[PDB]
């Protein structure tokens, strides 16, 4: 979901 997408994008 978006939360996971935020996780990966900020890495």
């Amino acid at each position, epitope marked *: *979901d*978006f*939360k996971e*997408e*935020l*996780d990966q*994008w*900020f890495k």
Partner: antibody, heavy 119, light 113 residues
Framework: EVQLQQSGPVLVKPGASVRMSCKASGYTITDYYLNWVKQSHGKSLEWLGVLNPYSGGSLYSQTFKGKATLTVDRSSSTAYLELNSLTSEDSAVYYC????????????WGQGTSVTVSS | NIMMTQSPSSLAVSAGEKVTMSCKSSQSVLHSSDQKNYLAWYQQKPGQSPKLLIYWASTRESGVPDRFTGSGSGTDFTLTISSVQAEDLAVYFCHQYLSSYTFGGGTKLEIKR
């Protein structure tokens, strides 16, 4: 000190595009992420997306995909928000706001750019 | 999306009074990798840009007076101002950034004199 200087207010015709700027000073623009947040009235805030000033990449809210485009000019320490296909409902103050990392709040906000969409 | 609801819409107190205001999320804002509630509070004074007060639900931003305190877990969050000052009048917004960022509708704090 830290400052986010945003460009002046604009009047735009419905259907057109607008690009506004957010100039970082007092810190290295590439050390923080930069969000864009819309305020339609005093009691409303809505997130558009976030820019990675170092890489130039961006992550958009699904609401603003295909509507907003985030860019950056690292040499001039300036980030940009472009909005297309403007409607009268796109009228709002648009803030840029920096964010250190994933878990941080929006620790500093520009003064906002007032966009009025009207004939 | 995660919806944020704030209550009350507005309140008014005399200087020196204590104030609490509520912020509820439609689901948990707890980030698993660091076990922090991705919950922030902002103060927006009239004609000014928002100012960060609290992050991680309870961590006070540098330069924020100690009278501002955030608390809560799960889906029920609270901003407390222990002794309201005349300059504290603003709209206070809460903010979840676990998922696609959403903000509460704000609580407008007014001063009685």
């Amino acid at each position: 000190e830290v400052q986010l200087q945003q460009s002046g207010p604009v009047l735009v015709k419905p259907g057109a595009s607008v690009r506004m700027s957010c100039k970082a000073s007092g810190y290295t623009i590439t050390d923080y992420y930069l969000n864009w947040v819309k305020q339609s009235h005093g009691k409303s805030l809505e997130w558009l997306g976030v820019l990675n000033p170092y890489s130039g990449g961006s992550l958009y809210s699904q609401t603003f995909k295909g509507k907003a485009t985030l860019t950056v000019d690292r040499s001039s320490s300036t980030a940009y928000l472009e909005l297309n296909s403007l409607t009268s409902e796109d009228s709002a103050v648009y803030y840029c706001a920096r964010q250190l990392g994933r878990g941080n709040g929006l620790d500093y906000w520009g003064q906002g750019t007032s966009v009025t969409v009207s004939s | 999306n995660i919806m944020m609801t704030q209550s009350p819409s507005s309140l008014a107190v005399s200087a020196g009074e204590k104030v609490t205001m509520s912020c509820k999320s439609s689901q948990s804002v707890l980030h698993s990798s660091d076990q922090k509630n991705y919950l922030a509070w902002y103060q927006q004074k009239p004609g000014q840009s928002p100012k960060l007060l609290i992050y991680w639900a309870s961590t006070r931003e540098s330069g924020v007076p100690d009278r501002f305190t955030g608390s809560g877990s799960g889906t029920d969050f609270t901003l407390t101002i222990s002794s309201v000052q005349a300059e504290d009048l603003a709209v206070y917004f809460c903010h979840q950034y676990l998922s696609s960022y959403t903000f509460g509708g704000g609580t407008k704090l007014e001063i009685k004199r």
